[PDB]
Amino acid sequence: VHHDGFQTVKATIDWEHPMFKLYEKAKRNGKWNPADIDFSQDQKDFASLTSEEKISALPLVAGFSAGEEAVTLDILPMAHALARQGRLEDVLFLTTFMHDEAKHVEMFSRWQQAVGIGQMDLSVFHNDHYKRIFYEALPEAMNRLYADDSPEAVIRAATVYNMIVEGTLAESGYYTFRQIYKKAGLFPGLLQGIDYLNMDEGRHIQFGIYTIQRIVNEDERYYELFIRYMDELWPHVIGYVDYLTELGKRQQQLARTYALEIDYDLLRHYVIKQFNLRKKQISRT
Amino acid sequence: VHHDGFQTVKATIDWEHPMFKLYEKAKRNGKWNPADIDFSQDQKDFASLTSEEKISALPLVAGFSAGEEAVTLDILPMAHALARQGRLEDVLFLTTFMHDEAKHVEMFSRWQQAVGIGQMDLSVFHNDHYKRIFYEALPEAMNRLYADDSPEAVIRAATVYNMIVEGTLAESGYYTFRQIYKKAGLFPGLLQGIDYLNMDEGRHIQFGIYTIQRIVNEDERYYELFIRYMDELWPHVIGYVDYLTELGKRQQQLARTYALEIDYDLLRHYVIKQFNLRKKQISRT
Numbered sequence: 001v002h003h004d005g006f007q008t009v010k011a012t013i014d015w016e017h018p019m020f021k022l023y024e025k026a027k028r029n030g031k032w033n034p035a036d037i038d039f040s041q042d043q044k045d046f047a048s049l050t051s052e053e054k055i056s057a058l059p060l061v062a063g064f065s066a067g068e069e070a071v072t073l074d075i076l077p078m079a080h081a082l083a084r085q086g087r088l089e090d091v092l093f094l095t096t097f098m099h100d101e102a103k104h105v106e107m108f109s110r111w112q113q114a115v116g117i118g119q120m121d122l123s124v125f126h127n128d129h130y131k132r133i134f135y136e137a138l139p140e141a142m143n144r145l146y147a148d149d150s151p152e153a154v155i156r157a158a159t160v161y162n163m164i165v166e167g168t169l170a171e172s173g174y175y176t177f178r179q180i181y182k183k184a185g186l187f188p189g190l191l192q193g194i195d196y197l198n199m200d201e202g203r204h205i206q207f208g209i210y211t212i213q214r215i216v217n218e219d220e221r222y223y224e225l226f227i228r229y230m231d232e233l234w235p236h237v238i239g240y241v242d243y244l245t246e247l248g249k250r251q252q253q254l255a256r257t258y259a260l261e262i263d264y265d266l267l268r269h270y271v272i273k274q275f276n277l278r279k280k281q282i283s284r285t
Numbered sequence: 286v287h288h289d290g291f292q293t294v295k296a297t298i299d300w301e302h303p304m305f306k307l308y309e310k311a312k313r314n315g316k317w318n319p320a321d322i323d324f325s326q327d328q329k330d331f332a333s334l335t336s337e338e339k340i341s342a343l344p345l346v347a348g349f350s351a352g353e354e355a356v357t358l359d360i361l362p363m364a365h366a367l368a369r370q371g372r373l374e375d376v377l378f379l380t381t382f383m384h385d386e387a388k389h390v391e392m393f394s395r396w397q398q399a400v401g402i403g404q405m406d407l408s409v410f411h412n413d414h415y416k417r418i419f420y421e422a423l424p425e426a427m428n429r430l431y432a433d434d435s436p437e438a439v440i441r442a443a444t445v446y447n448m449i450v451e452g453t454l455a456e457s458g459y460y461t462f463r464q465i466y467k468k469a470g471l472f473p474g475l476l477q478g479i480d481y482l483n484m485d486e487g488r489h490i491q492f493g494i495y496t497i498q499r500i501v502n503e504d505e506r507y508y509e510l511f512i513r514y515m516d517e518l519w520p521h522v523i524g525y526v527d528y529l530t531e532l533g534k535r536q537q538q539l540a541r542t543y544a545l546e547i548d549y550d551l552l553r554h555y556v557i558k559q560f561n562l563r564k565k566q567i568s569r570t
């Protein structure tokens with residue numbers, strides 16, 4: 001369907017729009033290139049490990065690589081829906097969001113290639129709870145926006161994508177990586193990537209907060225929907241977390257070798273903490 | 286609809302894919318930030334001009350600002366359609382494409398703001414031929430891809446967007462800017478922007494060539510469709526060009542003041558030249 005006109009012909013960008021400001025910050029802070037990361041020490045680290053130690057790291061990478069690829073593909077309906085609503089500054093910012101996620105896909109895939117597991121199918125580490133979130137609930141909620149851009153649908157999409165996948169799972173994953181491999185002194189290239197991803201993620205989560213809050217601001221009963229959609233996904237969040245913890249507990253050779261008292265009870269509490277603080281970042285009023 | 290799996294979990298990025306290579310070049314060559322361009326001399330240049338000289342430059346900027354905004358919004362269905370086909374490297378590259386166009390929208394809108402015309406509605410310089418391309422034919426061809434990603438539809442979308450809007454009109458616009466204002470010594474910030482846009486455009490056009498050629502390669506009768514879709518749009522291409530030429534011929538005070546023998550016959554021939562060389566960049570065989 002046609003364009004009725006163009007904002008930057010009739011007027012200009014809204015330079016004070018929060019999402020224009022975030023776009024500007026993304027340009028300034030988003031120059032890193034996965035192609036510049038030196039993975040040569042990562043290759044040697046991985047080769048030095050025993051088979052039982054090698055596998056320790058793969059469930060988490062399996063979760064991230066699928067996660068990055070899903071969100072790269074699944075942000076497109078959000079960009080479309082806000083575009084169709086004329087929210088030009090949102091769209092400008094979402095171009096940086098999409099490109100960030102492409103670089104994230106690239107980073108993990110370069111690490112897999114470099115350490116010699118690119119040929120390994122890591123889908124075996126996606127349990128039913130993970131698939132419910134990433135293979136199903138995430139694309140369902142985002143693709144809905146092509147035919148239903150109601151405030152309800154937009155809140156649901158931002159909740160699943162920005163508040164759960166990013167704001168709870170990705171953030172806890174970054175913490176888990178540092179708690180384990182930063183301690184061990186392992187995988188410096190991967191951990192450099194993680195630091196860049198974690199910095200990008202701040203803007204992604206801020207977009208979701210802004211999107212959810214601006215809809216809540218119109219009608220404070222959307223606050224209840226946000227909470228409900230958060231709670232709907234929690235069983236799968238913790239179900240996946242419990243599955244990874246069980247795998248960690250059953251393959252402890254990396255932890256012993258590297259003197260990591262890996263506190264899974266504490267990682268579990270960080271996830272709960274993330275989930276609850278994302279809820280608190282939306283105001284009913 | 287769901288994800289059946291993820292390429293970077295089952296395997297890796299296809300590192301040798303042409304669109305991965307283009308993505309890599311876009312990261313390396315796409316660091317420029319419109320926010321860094323110094324428009325202060327542009328403001329003084331524009332203020333120095335008489336009213337009749339001021340207006341000389343506005344039809345071309347009106348064409349570009351709407352053009353950039355349209356392509357920012359209208360590339361999203363192409364990204365979606367290739368995503369749904371599993372063409373991950375194409376999608377990675379298209380994130381740089383989208384972000385480039387966002388920066389282009391930003392550049393022209395910053396120039397308009399800086400020279401004091403942000404409040405002026407430049408839609409008056411879009412004639413019927415321009416609207417047929419940008420308000421209608423471009424969004425029609427791109428949005429079709431949401432429900433019809435047939436080789437025919439993809440060739441039509443790439444032809445209108447990459448070969449006509451970018452490969453014929455944008456390229457001729459860059460040439461026109463340099464022929465006029467680079468000569469005059471005017472608007473150094475705008476011309477810096479034009480050089481960055483022209484560099485980005487090379488990758489955009491290369492994406493369209495690759496997309497059209499890979500479909501032609503499957504069935505050489507799609508070559509005829511490419512030619513037909515090019516010729517379908519030519520009347521509006523030249524109809525818009527003739528309209529801008531007529532405006533230039535009727536407001537020659539900038540040209541006199543600045544000693545520009547503006548050769549409109551030569552600009553017209555450059556457009557024809559662009560159109561014909563884009564056709565020659567697709568091989569029937």
Ligand SMILES: CCCCCCCCCCCCCCCC(=O)O
Nearest residue numbers: 063064067068166170172173244267
């Ligand atoms: C053992 C402790 C459990 C910690 C939780 C680990 C979760 C792994 C993360 C996988 C999903 C990554 C989602 C990426 C989202 C994005 O890139 O925006």
Ligand SMILES: CCCCCCCCCCCCCCCC(=O)O
Nearest residue numbers: 348349352353451455457458529552
């Ligand atoms: C007077 C000589 C005519 C020269 C032709 C001028 C055409 C102006 C360009 C306006 C459309 C710009 C399209 C931008 C496309 C993109 O950003 O990829």
Ligand SMILES: [Fe+3]
Nearest residue numbers: 068101104197
């Ligand atoms: Fe990410």
Ligand SMILES: [Fe+3]
Nearest residue numbers: 071166201204
């Ligand atoms: Fe993210």
Ligand SMILES: [Fe+3]
Nearest residue numbers: 353386389482
């Ligand atoms: Fe452009």
Ligand SMILES: [Fe+3]
Nearest residue numbers: 356451486489
């Ligand atoms: Fe372009």
